[PDB]
Amino acid sequence: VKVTYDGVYVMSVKDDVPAADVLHAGDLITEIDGNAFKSSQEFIDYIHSKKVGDTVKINYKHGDKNEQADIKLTAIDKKGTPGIGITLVDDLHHH
Numbered sequence: 001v002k003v004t005y006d007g008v009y010v011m012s013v014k015d016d017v018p019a020a021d022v023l024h025a026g027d028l029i030t031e032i033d034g035n036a037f038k039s040s041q042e043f044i045d046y047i048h049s050k051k052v053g054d055t056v057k058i059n060y061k062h063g064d065k066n067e068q069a070d071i072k073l074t075a076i077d078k079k080g081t082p083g084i085g086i087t088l089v090d091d092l093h094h095h
């Protein structure tokens with residue numbers, strides 16, 4: 001048994017994107033589109049495999065409750081890269 005990976009912790013959320021109406025700084029994202037990822041890289045790769053305008057299902061914990069909601073992907077860079085519009089603690093550019 002290897003060390004446990006809980007998911008990705010949100011560090012910042014763009015205030016003018018759909019994500020701002022769901023996520024908050026500090027939230028832990030555990031699954032995206034019904035699946036658990038094993039690293040921030042896999043999580044990001046997955047988002048990049050989608051298209052701006054697509055909808056992703058996000059399972060996350062806010063405070064002391066496991067929530068679930070859909071978030072529409074927006075463009076996170078001038079090149080059109082799809083993203084939720086958040087920065088992650090692993091970053092220590094938006095995803």
Ligand SMILES: [Br-]
Nearest residue numbers: 008009089090
């Ligand atoms: Br992270």
